[PDB]
Subunit: 122 residues, 4 copies
């Protein structure tokens, strides 16, 4: 799944995730959100199961973006946790957590949760 | 917060998170879980807001562990999303998502959610 | 949206949610899961925004099932939190949390998270 | 655990949850949030495992509040999913999802996640 995961992916929001999967389990790349307080590409890094089970199971992985780049700083970070599923209709199915920096008093309202599905087309 | 975040952290479960925060927003290190299908240290990587707001707000960050190392392969990955809060009682308050690789039929039961609080003591 | 929400709904897993929305914000009904340690119908109760905003916004709602009925007891409960979106292709888009009773030592692994989309067909 | 759960509970934010646990698995009561766009008491309803396991395990439960009452309408609903743990230091440990009604374009940012711990004191 180094081969399967490496490449450009697109989610339901029209965001673009460009990733390289290394031999040893690393994920590196860039993320460009179609939504939110984001412009242009942001660094991402993560990890994946480089020796998944061979039984029709997905490959577990995750990655982070901090929403700071040369253009904007949204004082926030998203992590996506999910699985890669190969085949003609390959997919990365994820759930995500977006934490903003907050005061202590507002920490209860720090974190959004959602779900993104990535495909190799659209 | 490069200074504040770099170091060894411990959560409520007795897990140990050893991290280096780079100038440019990178997080690198190792994680050792006190629980679950885990032994010894696992690579982690992540990202943080390297220019947080200066208003008493936390610093947003996140990181991933894939639960594969030389000892075990748990076909799973956790991402932690949270904020660093500095001061005499510094803390990293997180929520996490642990995805296992699953068959398609079992993908509904792929993902655990929880919350870990890291301190510099215990 | 009393009218819109009341009725039979079906999710992507093939589960069936039969609900009545009361004037005053109550949700009552039954749930039958196509997956998991479940058989036949389980009681549900919940709440919805009975005076939503009139601006194209969804209607917030939520409900709970405890997975005990006359046939089985799965020592667990799911809550769905989401929004109803009306129109020709009405939908209830949710995220859910399924907590199992656990020992204290296993409480870290108590809670699954996922997402279900309900429609009036299938 | 009808006996154990029925009563007044307080969380880390200073919110108050007043609940009655019925024989048959129902939860009914009121919730008053110390934070957010909330004033005074809101109806809640939910469900619990009325025949939990007898092995030191918690009792699974959940409940919903829609944030509409006679004073305010926050176009939102929270569900708490968790477990009751009895004994001298009884607790209800929960994770929650707060969904707001949103436009379709903003549905990605509809849902907050967090965690509340309820005790019988404070």
């Amino acid at each position: 799944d180094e081969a399967g995961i490496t490449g450009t992916w697109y989610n339901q929001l029209g965001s673009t995730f460009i990733v390289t999967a290394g031999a040893d389990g690393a994920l590196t790349g860039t993320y460009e959100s179609a939504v939110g307080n984001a412009e242009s590409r942001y660094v991402l890094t993560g990890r994946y199961d480089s020796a998944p089970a061979t039984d029709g199971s997905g490959t577990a992985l995750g990655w982070t973006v901090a929403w700071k780049n040369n253009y904007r700083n949204a004082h926030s970070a998203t992590t996506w946790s999910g699985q890669y599923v190969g085949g003609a209709e390959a997919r990365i199915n994820t759930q995500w957590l977006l934490t903003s920096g907050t005061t202590e008093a507002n920490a209860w309202k720090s974190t959004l949760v959602g779900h993104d599905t990535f495909t190799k087309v659209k």
